[model samples]
Target: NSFSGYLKLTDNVYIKNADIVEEAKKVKPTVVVNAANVYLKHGGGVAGALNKATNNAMQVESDDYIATNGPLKVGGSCVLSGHNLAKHCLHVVGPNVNKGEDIQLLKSAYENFNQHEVLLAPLLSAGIFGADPIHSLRVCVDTVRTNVYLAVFDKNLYDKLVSSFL
Candidate 1:
């Protein structure tokens, strides 16, 4: 219980195994947190879905962020301004899981955000970008990703997650 901060939770908030993209489409978060490549061209998995959802407008700011801050490294985050759809997309350069990197950078990106209405899908653990899901969830809970929603298709798994932490 090392987490310290203020997280506002609504009674409507519920954790379940649902499609992240679908859930996000419904939530339409002001800040859609996700991962992308250094150049920002790579958007697979959640990023790919987010890319299309935001009409690729997020790319505009992301490209600019990368341009102004070129050669983005792991853990580096670029706050992409929003469009007609959402306010902004927290496009963070995910860790090279192939290396020894864990979810620290991804977690850092979320922590850096000043906005509370953040949406998060599994950052590192799945196709294209791979990592340990067990550890990722552990970090997710340890960091107490406040004001965030996890989108996935594992209802049973989400149900097992302790809601008291929220």
Candidate 2:
């Protein structure tokens, strides 16, 4: 049995089954934004597992660095764990879970560190569950952090990413 159309039908059914109207009625005037097709699938099972393991290892190493070096002392509303030897890490609150002014702040951070070849880890889906690619790209370009080693599920996004110094 072909399941091509079945997935679409199931998706429609799930959407229709949601109580969005009732939920909206309970709250004040609100605007609901619909997001779709943000994630992609990978065929590498072992590679995916290994990637996760490596990320965990990297996180551990970062934690050790932070612990030994001490927490970043930037005067921001939020505190980030890693130490910024070159400078401070600016933490910006995002709008909802996916939108906000973080992109601007990230750009600023990169611009501040433009002279040096710094290593930036994956920002992760921290503020936003799945941040918009345009926003992500804007932040990456504007921030201008050189040699960013981003840890993301999508490798294609990192393809054209140019170093802030280069």
Candidate 3:
């Protein structure tokens, strides 16, 4: 049996898992921040997921950011403009994801950052593709700019990713 945990906020609001955005809106939340664990069942690749998320974000005129475990392909990071929305996409190649020595390079990208908002990162090649989600999340969470909202697919994998923070 799988045991799912739950979080209860003030005003009788409760949420299970990470789909906070959808749940909040359902309850008519005055301030809703949709942070959730998005599960991808596999089929294409990181580029496909990024494109879908980017398009969705663009459609809603939302400022978005995407991060992936590295050695990212060139054409995988392109962002289309002219919709009054901007996306700051980052490609982070962690040690396990690439040649084991790239973690330093990944960490260096955020050394002089001063962004003061929640950064949403989608695990591109992580999860059940390149390496285990736990390892991928570890490297990413360690090196991110701060206030990271990570998206994952598998529940077991999400647990592994969250265990890193503990």
Q: Pick by TM-score: which candidate is best?
A: 1
lDDT of 3 by residue, 1-166 (tens): 1113443222222223443222222332222122111221112344344435445543232223322422233212322231211224333222233433343433443321213243334443353234455454454445444444443445775665455544
> What residue pairs are clashing in model 3?
21-34, 39-153, 70-92, 70-93
In candidate 2, stretches whose alpha carbon ends up further than 4 angstroms from where it belongs are: 1-56, 73-103, 112-130, 142-166
lDDT comparing candidate 3 with the true structure = 0.34
Kindly indicate the candidate among 1 and 3 with the higher TM-score: 1
How do the candidates rank by lDDT, highest first? 1, 3, 2
- State the lDDT of candidate 2 residue by residue for 1-166, as single tens digits: 0011111111111011122222222321112111111111111222223223334442454356456654432211222232211122222222223543343344433343344343323332222334554465455544444433233334344333333112
- Please, what are the lDDT tens digits per residue for candidate 1 over residues 4-73? 2213334322244666556556656676666566688746777777677667766666677677878666
Each candidate's clash count: 1, 3, 4
| Ten-residue stretch with the least lDDT total in model 3 | 33-42
lDDT of 2 at 24: 23
